[PDB]
Design a protein around this ligand. Structure first.
Ligand SMILES: *[C@@H]1O[C@H](CO)[C@@H](O)[C@H](O)[C@H]1NC(C)=O
Ligand SMILES: *[C@@H]1O[C@H](CO)[C@@H](O)[C@H](O)[C@H]1NC(C)=O
Lengths: 49, 49
């Protein structure tokens, strides 16, 4: 109800990282979610104020 | 997962009041959370439109 039909703001609920979309495939006696996320990769530091 | 590793917008979940931070101390056969909050204290009333 939450991850598929909308965007989830709860941290580490519908996937490790920031949440974008989900896809609900079926399976024998169960369901399999495919979560799509967004993870920063390359970082660089600066001086702030 | 939710209160510590991020901020929570859920009401009355990670502490009474608006939520800021939490620290997860340990304890035998359990765990103890310390929640920081934010409570408005004084009041003053006016007329609006
Ligand atoms: C940025 O972080 C690196 C650590 O990998 C550090 O050596 C460097 O001094 C930092 N940048 C500045 C401007 O200090
Ligand atoms: C503000 O609230 C008090 C109740 O404590 C009331 O007596 C007062 O008339 C109110 N002031 C205004 C401007 O509504």
């Amino acid at each position: 109800s939450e991850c598929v039909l909308g965007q989830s703001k709860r941290v580490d609920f519908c996937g490790k990282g920031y949440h974008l979309m989900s896809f609900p495939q079926s399976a024998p006696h169960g369901v399999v979610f495919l979560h799509v996320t967004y993870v920063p990769a390359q970082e660089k530091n600066f001086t702030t104020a």
